[PDB]
Design a protein around this nucleic acid. Structure first.
Ligand SMILES: [Li+]
Ligand SMILES: [Li+]
Ligand SMILES: [Li+]
Length: 1214
RNA sequence: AAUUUCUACUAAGUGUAGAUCGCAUCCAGUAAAG
DNA sequence: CTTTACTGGATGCGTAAAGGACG
DNA sequence: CGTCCTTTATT
């Protein structure tokens, strides 16, 4: 009955649930006594190292094989590639060449002798030890000799490097899809602009960059591509384009450089080259690890014995004898830094430039010109071209008798005598005696003095940097610059320390670093099947509502095997979990084993058809031998006791299957069982005592005895895993992991609210302004203690029954929906998200801003304005970088805000059976508050698509539609690509064009171009109007237009409009940068100012009788204000009104503000609401198309509203 | 101002409401400084 | 442009049972 | 020769 009700059980998805895991009894003691966690903590860091060691071999294998390759009909792919016109024939003759090109690369890899042990224990046990030379590196590898299985994850990531398929991860994809097309695009460019490159240049590149082994033109010939397959070749090639530095410090100009300098000297339109991409797994000052590392490298780079301090005392001596060197020989560079050097020497920021302005005049000024606006624009040009200022050119700017060269020594010594003072306050840090009282990140007092020192020293050197002076100058006093540049180049070492100490000290004080636990099992907790309980040494227990993970110690693997009691009262329950995982692989695996293929002796008919693949779809498909293979499979399952008993199969008659999938889908659906058997609590509790078993309660706060009220969605999912009413909607999956997360704080540094003192409540609509508890409350308590983490993957809808193309199903239901609602969601600079809900006729049902999230529970309505919060935390991030206090996390404030939004949209969807209309989003961002909102919207999209993959209402009875077992699926599986289209399920992506600047009452939009241009053009504008008159009864000027008389107005449906001088508009400063215009009185001012009797009927003739351009310019400016329907001021959040120059059916102008005031407004309340509304309306229009197509044609309907269709729809539907 | 984790919270007190796909790998960008 | 963290999309696994060495 | 680590199957 609702459209939603169709979208349950449509496709499967996976999720991971996270839990704390609490040791029970003495298992944390036993774990500590057997020092298991130290062992797992080390294994993790060893693991990191061996992977890098393996990668070293992986890289070498890739490399030599890539050098080995010569690509066959590479050159012929290139010939067909560059063809401008290519047939539908040869468009796909080419695309098969792409496939075979890639196939060649992968076959080169998989053809190598070694490939076979690249991802098996032999690479650890055999290949790598022979490959490495370091005895330590080899020892590190050998320490995994019993443990190679743990690398099974890593090895899959590496097998993907060697695939043929069009995957981001594939080497072949990088080579052919990405790198080769760039090379041929480069080939295109290089043959056009080859003329530009002088004979000198090509050979300079050939000499220094290429070693003279290859000519520069070789790298743009087709048959050289093979050279650039390896990274060694990519590095030469991108050096040719970008240039590079040889080790003499000579910068070598690359061809892009010569292209860019040609583009300026010629002022031409050249395309430069794009650089090629990195090759998979080649490896192209790093951040501090420890806390006392920082104290040491602080002390050791900045103490009084440091190199950095020595130059400080050396720079002091040079400036103390500043009088002695030549004032013609020292220079002050001319930069944006120049006005602060001016205000230090003379007192005013503009003195230096103004005095230079004076003497430029002395030579270049004659009184005839007086001055001109570009002769002063040509004096501004030469000042930015002055590279430097001599210490004499500054003294000649000085009036008597201020000595600029002694004043500059006062300024510098004032800067070093303050550095020594910061060395007084910082001395006890420098002693070895000093011991760190607190965590460094928490401990702001010492951090402030490190920053106090680093800041004053950085403040010093960047001041004196101006004394290099771009030099570059013919007669420097190298007496001075000699010592200066040695000191300056040493003093500059501080900036790396500066950034590195800052980045460490302003991290989050708590950390989420964890390391994986194995319990001496390389395949620990791999799966849950009962058959493998001992193999994985992990299983799940439960006591009433409380669930436990129980782990067998490696010495007592069978310790849960033989336990029973008849009463579950005071006894645990063992999970009895059986899985047949992926029949398509496990049925051939078992029945064609060497262990069993004798026992079930398959027909020589059966082997022929399995090997030849006659049961699969394709040309060699034969249904009757596919029946026979299914028949074989059913009868051997019947004699494979391990399956036949666990699942009591009830297959279809084999003659009702159309394909092999039909039977597999039946096996997989039935091949899963979960139950509980009783297990004595006494004997289990003792295993835990003795250290034969380790028990952790699976826990989150919903499991606490103090919990009332709604559980986490994820708590529902976990519990439902074992509920009898869950008939496979959610399966419990394998591949769980258990981690250990060491504490990163201690309670003693934690912020606390102590017991019995009253705490303030933060919501002001709550009349209980205080809460007072009987215990301490601590910020971030969860990080003040070690914590075990359990990750449990689940499988939602593992056997979907409702298979259909979701997009086409949404079209059919929409077609036959008498009143389909639409949710239009819009972003504006003023409003984070704006929302309008329309019914199936475009009636506004709801419209409001989501800048504030409203929530009501227990009658307490709280509003949380995330717009304010998002900006406040934004500014907390600029304050922390300068004050060196911990990052304010704004990544997550967005996620927190989006979480609220997503719940609200899903409640609107359920309430209205509505589809969503989303704004297509622009590439650029303009302002720094406007980016954070573009990302907020872009993150809103990702999460909203996700929730709509399996959309659950926690309130519902869990097996109702919309319940946790029957979640809705109204968006398609993938988040982004490539199945992307204009539509994703219920979501339709809508372009924004004329959704904002459009009168919603009339559909009127502005298609006139009113920029002044010329007097000559301005007369046909005024003369294309049907009439321009004055209506005294309304104090308005009417401009009656037929858009057919103007250019590029096809889009508009209603050709004829009458425009009026109604109300007011807001003008922008061209150089309070806004003034408010009153339209009708400005028209009278203009016509009165120039003598144009405006009360005389049609006045188009008289306006063109004027020939003062001052008139026409001002007339065209007023015309632009009348048609500017959206008026507002940026920054001020007050006005966003939308006013129209066109009258409606009942003869009244549209004013957004007439509706902003109301609470049940039938028209938009401002330009943002107008956008959302019209975003929804374009989807309504789409739905109309759906209603005009027959069902069989629905999936071909164009939902892309044309601008000409939109205007017609908007101009007709009201 | 507590959390598997995140956001906003604290109505009678160790919690409330909503959100929450992990782990590994590869790769692009984009900001800053010399 | 080099050094480095932030965040972004893309690829794989989410397994029991055959297979084999090994003390 | 039972135990524990590796390798296998692919709608
Ligand atoms: Li809750
Ligand atoms: Li607080
Ligand atoms: Li409560």
């Amino acid at each position: 009955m609702s459209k939603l009700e169709k979208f349950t059980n449509c496709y499967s998805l996976s999720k991971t649930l996270r839990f704390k895991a609490i040791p029970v009894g003495k298992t944390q003691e036993n774990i500590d006594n057997k020092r298991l966690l130290v062992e797992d903590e080390k294994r993790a860091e060893d693991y990191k190292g061996v992977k890098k060691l393996l990668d070293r071999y992986y890289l070498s294998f890739i490399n030599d094989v890539l050098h080995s390759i010569k690509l066959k009909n590479l050159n012929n792919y290139i010939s067909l590639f560059r063809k401008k016109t290519r047939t539908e024939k040869e468009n796909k003759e080419l695309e098969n060449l792409e496939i075979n090109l890639r196939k060649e690369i992968a076959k080169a890899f998989k053809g190598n002798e070694g490939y076979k042990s690249l991802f098996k224990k032999d690479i650890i046990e055999t290949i790598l030890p022979e490959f490495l030379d370091d005895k330590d590196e080899i020892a590190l590898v050998n320490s995994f000799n019993g443990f190679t299985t743990a690398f099974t994850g890593f090895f899959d990531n590496r097998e993907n490097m060697f695939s043929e398929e069009a995957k981001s991860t594939s080497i072949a994809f990088r080579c052919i899809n990405e790198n080769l097309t760039r090379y041929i695009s480069n080939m295109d460019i290089f043959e056009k602009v080859d003329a530009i490159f002088d004979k000198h240049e090509v050979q300079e590149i050939k000499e220094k960059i290429l070693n003279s082994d290859y000519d520069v033109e070789d790298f743009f010939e087709g048959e050289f591509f093979n050279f650039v397959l390896t990274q060694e070749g990519i590095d030469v090639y991108n050096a040719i384009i970008g240039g590079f530095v040889t080790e003499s410090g000579e910068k070598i100009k690359g061809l892009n450089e010569y292209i860019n300098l040609y583009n300026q000297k010629t002022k031409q339109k050249l395309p430069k080259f794009k650089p090629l991409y990195k090759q998979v797994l080649s490896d192209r000052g790093e951040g501090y690890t420890s806390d006392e590392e920082v104290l040491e490298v602080f002390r050791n780079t900045l103490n009084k014995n440091s190199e950095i301090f020595s130059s400080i005392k050396k720079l002091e001596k040079l400036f103390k004898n500043f009088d002695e060197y030549s004032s013609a020989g020292i220079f002050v560079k001319n930069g944006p830094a120049i006005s602060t050097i001016s205000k230090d020497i003379f007192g005013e920021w503009n003195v230096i430039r103004d005095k230079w302005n004076a003497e430029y005049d002395d030579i270049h000024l004659k009184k005839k010109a007086v001055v001109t606006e570009k002769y002063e624009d040509d004096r501004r040009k030469s000042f930015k071209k002055i590279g430097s200022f001599s210490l004499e050119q500054l003294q000649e700017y000085a009036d008597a008798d201020l000595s600029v060269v002694e004043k500059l020594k006062e300024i510098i010594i004032q800067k070093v005598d303050e550095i020594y003072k910061v060395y007084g306050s910082s001395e006890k840090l420098f002693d070895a005696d000093f011991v760190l009282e607190k965590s460094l990140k928490k401990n702001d007092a010492v951090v402030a003095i490190m920053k106090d020192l680093l800041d004053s020293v950085k403040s010093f050197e960047n001041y004196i940097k101006a004394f290099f002076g771009e030099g570059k100058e013919t007669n420097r006093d190298e007496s001075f610059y000699g010592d200066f540049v040695l000191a300056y180049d040493i003093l500059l070492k501080v900036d790396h320390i500066y950034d590195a100490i800052r980045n460490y000290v302003t991290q989050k004080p708590y950390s989420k670093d964890k390391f994986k636990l194995y319990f001496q099992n390389p395949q620990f907790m791999g799966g849950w099947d009962k058959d493998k309980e001992t193999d994985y040494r992990a299983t799940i227990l439960r006591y009433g509502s409380k669930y436990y993970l129980a782990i067998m110690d490696k010495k007592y693997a069978k310790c849960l095997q033989k336990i029973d009691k008849d009463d579950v009262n005071g006894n645990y329950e063992k999970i009895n979990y059986k899985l047949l995982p992926g029949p398509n692989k496990m049925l051939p695996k078992v029945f064609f084993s060497k262990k069993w293929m004798a026992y079930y002796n398959p027909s020589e008919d059966i082997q022929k058809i399995y090997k030849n693949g006659t049961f699969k779809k394709g040309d060699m498909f034969n249904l009757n031998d596919c029946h026979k293979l299914i028949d074989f499979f059913k009868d051997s399952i019947s004699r494979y006791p391990k399956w036949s008993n666990a699942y009591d199969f009830n297959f279809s008659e084999t003659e009702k299957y159309k394909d092999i999938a039909g039977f597999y889908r039946e096996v997989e659906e039935q091949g899963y069982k979960v139950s509980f058997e009783s297990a004595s609590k006494k004997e289990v509790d003792k295993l835990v005592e003795e250290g034969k078993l380790y028990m952790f309660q699976i826990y989150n706060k919903d499991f606490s005895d103090k919990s009332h009220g709604t559980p986490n969605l994820h708590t529902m999912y976990f519990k439902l895993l074992f509920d009898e009413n869950n008939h496979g909607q959610i399966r419990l999956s394998g591949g769980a992991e258990l981690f250990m997360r060491r504490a990163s704080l201690k309670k003693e540094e934690l912020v606390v609210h102590p017991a019995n003192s009253p705490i303030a409540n933060k919501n002001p609509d709550n009349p209980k302004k205080t809460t007072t508890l009987s215990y301490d409350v601590y910020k971030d308590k969860r990080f003040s203690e070690d914590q075990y983490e359990l990750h449990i993957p689940i499988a939602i809808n593992k056997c979907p029954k409702n298979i259909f193309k979701i997009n086409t199903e949404v079209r059919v239901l929409l077609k036959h929906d008498d009143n389909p609602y639409v949710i239009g969601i819009d972003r504006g600079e003023r409003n984070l998200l704006y929302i309008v809900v329309v019914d199936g006729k475009g009636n506004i049902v709801e419209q409001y801003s989501l800048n504030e999230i409203i929530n009501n529970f227990n009658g307490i309505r709280i509003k949380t304005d995330y717009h304010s919060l998002l900006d406040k935390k934004e500014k907390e991030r600029f304050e922390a970088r300068q004050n060196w206090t911990s990052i304010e996390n704004i990544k997550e404030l967005k996620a927190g805000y989006i979480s609220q939004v997503v719940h609200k949209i899903c409640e609107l969807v359920e309430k209205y059976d509505a589809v969503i209309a989303l704004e297509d989003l622009n590439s650029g961002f303009k302002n720094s508050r406007v980016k954070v909102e573009k990302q907020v919207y872009q993150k809103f999209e990702k999460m909203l698509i996700d929730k709509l993959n399996y959309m659950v209402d926690k309130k519902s009875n869990p097996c109702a539609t919309g319940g946790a077992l029957k979640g809705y699926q109204i968006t398609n599986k993938f988040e982004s690509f490539k199945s992307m289209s204009t539509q994703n399920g219920f979501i339709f992506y809508i372009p924004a064009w004329l959704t904002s600047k459009i009168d919603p009452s009339t559909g009127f939009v502005n298609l006139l171009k009113t920029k002044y241009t010329s007097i000559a053009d301005s007369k046909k504008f005024i003369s294309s109007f049907d009439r321009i008159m004055y209506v005294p009864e309304e104090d308005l000027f009417e401009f009656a237009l037929d858009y057919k008389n103007f250019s590029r107005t096809d889009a508009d449906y209603i050709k004829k409009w009458k425009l009026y001088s109604y109300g007011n508009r807001i003008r922008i400063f061209r150089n309070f940068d806004w003034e408010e215009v009153c339209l009708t009185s400005a028209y009278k001012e203009l016509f009165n100012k120039y003598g144009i009797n405006y009360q005389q009927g049609d006045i188009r003739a008289l306006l063109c009788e004027q020939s003062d351009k001052a008139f026409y310019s001002s007339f065209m400016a007023l015309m632009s204000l009348m048609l500017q329907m959206r008026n507002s001021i940026t920054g001020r959040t007050d006005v966003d009104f939308l006013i129209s120059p066109v009258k409606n059916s009942d003869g009244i102008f549209y004013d957004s503000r007439n509706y902003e005031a109301q609470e049940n407004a039938i028209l938009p309340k401002n330009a943002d609401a107008n956008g959302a509304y019209n975003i929804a309306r374009k989807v309504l229009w789409a739905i109309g198309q759906f209603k005009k197509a027959e069902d069989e044609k629905l999936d071909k309907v164009k939902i892309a509203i044309s601008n000409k269709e939109w205007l017609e729809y908007a101009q007709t539907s009201v």
